Structure 1
Amino acid sequence: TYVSLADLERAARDVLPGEIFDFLAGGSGTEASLVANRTALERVFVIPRMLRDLTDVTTEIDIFGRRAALPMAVAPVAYQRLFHPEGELAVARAARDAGVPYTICTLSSVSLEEIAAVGGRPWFQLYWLRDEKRSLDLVRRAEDAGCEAIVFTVDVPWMGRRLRDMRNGFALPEWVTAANFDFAPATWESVEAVRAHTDLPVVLKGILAVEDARRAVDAGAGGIVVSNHGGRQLDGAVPGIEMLGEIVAAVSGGCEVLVDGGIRSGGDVLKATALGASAVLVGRPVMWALAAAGQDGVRQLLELLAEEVRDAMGLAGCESVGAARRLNTKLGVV
Structure 2
Amino acid sequence: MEITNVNEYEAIAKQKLPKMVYDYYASGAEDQWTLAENRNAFSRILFRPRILIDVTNIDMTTTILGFKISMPIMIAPTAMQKMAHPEGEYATARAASAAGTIMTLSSWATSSVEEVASTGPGIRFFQLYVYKDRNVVAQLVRRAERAGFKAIALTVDTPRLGRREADIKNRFVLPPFLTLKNFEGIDLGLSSYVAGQIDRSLSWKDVAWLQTITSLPILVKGVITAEDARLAVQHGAAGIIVSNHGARQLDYVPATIMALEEVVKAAQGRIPVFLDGGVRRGTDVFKALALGAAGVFIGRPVVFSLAAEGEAGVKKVLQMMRDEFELTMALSGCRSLKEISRSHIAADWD
TM-score range, shorter chain: over 0.9
Q: Which residue of 2 aligns with 1:90?
A: 91
Q: Which residue of 2 aligns with 1:44?
A: 45
* SS of the residue 1:321 aligns to: coil
Q: Distance in 2 between matches of 1:213 and 1:92?
A: 30
Shift of 1:331: 2.6
The one of 274, 288, 294 equivalent to 2:310 is 294
The one of 239, 249, 254 equivalent to 2:255 is 239
1:75 and 2:50 correspond: no
1:315 and 2:331 correspond: yes
Contact 2:101–2:123 (CA under 8 A) maintained in structure 1 = no
The one of 118, 141, 144 equivalent to 2:143 is 141
The one of 209, 212, 230 equivalent to 1:196 is 212
Letter in 2 for 1:317: G
* SS of the residue 1:165 aligns to: helix
Q: Distance in 1 between matches of 2:341 and 2:93?
A: 28
Q: Which residue of 2 aligns with 1:211?
A: 227
Q: Which residue of 2 aligns with 1:23?
A: 24
Q: Rate the CA distance shift 1:196–1:52 in 2: closer, same or farther, 3 A.
A: farther
Letter in 2 for 1:120: G
1:262 and 2:278 correspond: yes
Structure 2: 5+ residue runs without aligned partners? 185-196
Letter in 1 for 2:318: L
Q: How many residues align?
A: 333
Aligned residue runs from structure 1 range 52-131, under 5 A = 52-118=53-119, 119-131=121-133
Q: Which residue of 1 aligns with 2:203?
A: 187
Query: Comparing 6-15 with 150-159, which one deviates more in the overlay?
Result: 6-15
Contact 1:223–1:256 (CA under 8 A) maintained in structure 2 = yes
Shift of 1:314: 1.2
Q: Distance in 2 between matches of 1:163 and 1:196?
A: 38
* SS of the residue 1:311 aligns to: helix
Shift of 1:234: 0.5
Give the TM-score normalised by structure 2. Answer: 0.92
Contact 1:286–1:298 (CA under 8 A) maintained in structure 2 = yes
Letter in 2 for 1:129: Y
Seq. identity, %: 41
Letter in 2 for 1:36: E
Structure 1: 5+ residue runs without aligned partners? none
Shift of 1:332: 4.0
Contact 2:225–2:262 (CA under 8 A) maintained in structure 1 = no
Shift of 1:294: 0.4
Shift of 1:193: 1.5
Contact 1:46–1:274 (CA under 8 A) maintained in structure 2 = no
Q: Distance in 2 between matches of 1:177 and 1:250?
A: 40
Q: Distance in 1 between matches of 2:215 and 2:330?
A: 37
Shift of 1:120: 1.0
Shift of 1:232: 0.2
Shift of 1:326: 4.1
Aligned-CA RMSD value:
1.4
Letter in 2 for 1:256: P
Question: 1:1-39, CA deviations, whole angstroms, 9 ceiling, x for partnerless residues?
Answer: 521112211221122111111111101110011111112
Letter in 2 for 1:309: F
The one of 219, 224, 227 equivalent to 2:240 is 224
Shift of 1:306: 1.0
Q: Distance in 1 between matches of 2:168 and 2:100?
A: 38
Q: Which residue of 2 aligns with 1:5?
A: 6
Question: 1:233-274, CA deviations, whole angstroms, 9 ceiling, x for partnerless residues?
Answer: 001112211111111111111111001110011110011111
Q: Distance in 2 between matches of 1:195 and 1:311?
A: 41
1:305 and 2:287 correspond: no
Q: Distance in 2 between matches of 1:240 and 1:44?
A: 13
Q: Which residue of 2 aligns with 1:14?
A: 15
Q: Distance in 2 between matches of 1:65 and 1:189?
A: 27
Contact 2:332–2:344 (CA under 8 A) maintained in structure 1 = no
Moved over 3 A (4+): 325-328
Q: Distance in 1 between matches of 2:305 and 2:163?
A: 26
Give the TM-score normalised by structure 1. Answer: 0.96
Letter in 1 for 2:167: D
Question: 1:42-95, CA deviations, whole angstroms, 9 ceiling, x for partnerless residues?
Answer: 211122222333232111110011111111111000100010010001001001
Shift of 1:214: 0.9
Q: Which residue of 1 aligns with 2:190?
A: none
Q: Distance in 2 between matches of 1:179 and 1:148?
A: 20
